[PDB]
Design a protein around this ligand. Structure first.
Ligand SMILES: *[C@@H]1O[C@H](CO)[C@@H](O[C@@H]2O[C@H](CO)[C@@H](O)[C@H](O)[C@H]2NC(C)=O)[C@H](O)[C@H]1NC(C)=O
Ligand SMILES: *[C@@H]1O[C@H](CO)[C@@H](O[C@@H]2O[C@H](CO)[C@@H](O)[C@H](O)[C@H]2NC(C)=O)[C@H](O)[C@H]1NC(C)=O
Ligand SMILES: *[C@@H]1O[C@H](CO)[C@@H](O)[C@H](O)[C@H]1NC(C)=O
Ligand SMILES: *[C@@H]1O[C@H](CO)[C@@H](O)[C@H](O)[C@H]1NC(C)=O
Ligand SMILES: *[C@@H]1O[C@H](CO)[C@@H](O)[C@H](O)[C@H]1NC(C)=O
Lengths: 50, 50, 50, 49
């Protein structure tokens, strides 16, 4: 938590966390000489809700 | 955090040994309007970053 | 009963000083009235339980 | 004007006046309250806290 210190306890905190048991999404891309176009689509252009 | 003139097909270039293409995700050499600007540091030898 | 002083009850803050510092004296009384009603309700419920 | 970062702060009082022993009002990094301060030695603050 932001600049807070908590010491020898448990904390029940509502926050912004991943869902336990979900998977990831590799979006890294290594080019060598060319520069595609299907790389730049809503498959790879993603959403930001929370 | 600034309003940039974003390229259609953005990409980068490794600053160790340069590639065929050039790093060009914007062409904005006129200091555009910015909301935020900062510099942070990390460990150069650490494997995983989150 | 002590943790009832950290509920907002519909007001914008649980703190009587963050309301008096950030709202006009017309607009502050609407929030202070909701805090007064929530805390008086908590005290009535405790008094019936005893 | 009126859009950006080069602000004329004009802060209340970031005084170096931590007076221990008596009741004071505090606005510590955004948090408001009243209390009595008492100096101590503490080894649990990292540099973000
Ligand atoms: C954050 O760090 C970067 C890189 O160290 C700084 O960018 C350099 O800025 C100087 C002065 O304008 C230039 O001469 C260099 O060519 C820049 N390097 C690169 C790689 O762009 C940047 O100025 C720093 N930002 C702040 C706010 O200090
Ligand atoms: C005006 O701004 C100056 C900026 O220097 C303020 O003085 C600073 O106060 C902080 C808080 O302790 C210190 O860390 C700085 O070292 C001070 N500056 C100098 C040069 O010593 C000052 O408080 C402001 N005053 C008003 C009336 O706004
Ligand atoms: C650990 O937390 C408990 C919580 O009540 C506390 O009583 C105890 O003193 C803590 N341990 C140490 C070493 O401070
Ligand atoms: C990258 O920029 C340099 C300097 O402007 C230029 O000489 C070079 O041709 C550019 N590379 C490409 C692939 O256009
Ligand atoms: C982290 O940095 C320190 C000093 O900068 C270094 O001694 C240490 O080996 C680094 N560890 C990793 C995992 O990068």
């Amino acid at each position: 938590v932001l600049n807070r210190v908590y010491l020898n306890t448990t904390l029940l905190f509502t926050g912004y966390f991943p869902k336990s048991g979900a998977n990831f999404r590799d979006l890294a891309l290594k080019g060598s000489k060319y520069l595609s176009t299907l790389w730049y689509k809503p498959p790879f252009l993603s959403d930001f809700n929370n | 955090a600034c309003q940039y003139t974003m390229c259609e097909y953005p990409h980068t270039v490794c600053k160790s040994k340069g590639s065929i293409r050039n790093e060009s995700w914007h062409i904005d050499s006129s200091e555009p309007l910015c909301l935020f600007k900062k510099n942070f540091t990390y460990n150069v030898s650490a494997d995983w970053l989150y | 009963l002590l943790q009832q002083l950290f509920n907002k009850f519909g007001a914008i803050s649980s703190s009587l000083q963050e309301i008096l510092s950030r709202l006009d004296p017309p607009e502050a009384q609407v929030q202070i009235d909701r805090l007064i009603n929530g805390r008086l309700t908590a005290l009535n419920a405790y008094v019936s339980q005893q | 004007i009126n859009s950006g970062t080069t602000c004329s702060n004009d802060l209340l009082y970031s005084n170096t006046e931590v007076s221990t022993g008596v009741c004071v009002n505090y606005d510590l990094y955004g948090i408001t309250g009243q209390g009595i301060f008492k100096e101590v030695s503490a080894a649990y603050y990292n540099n973000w806290q």
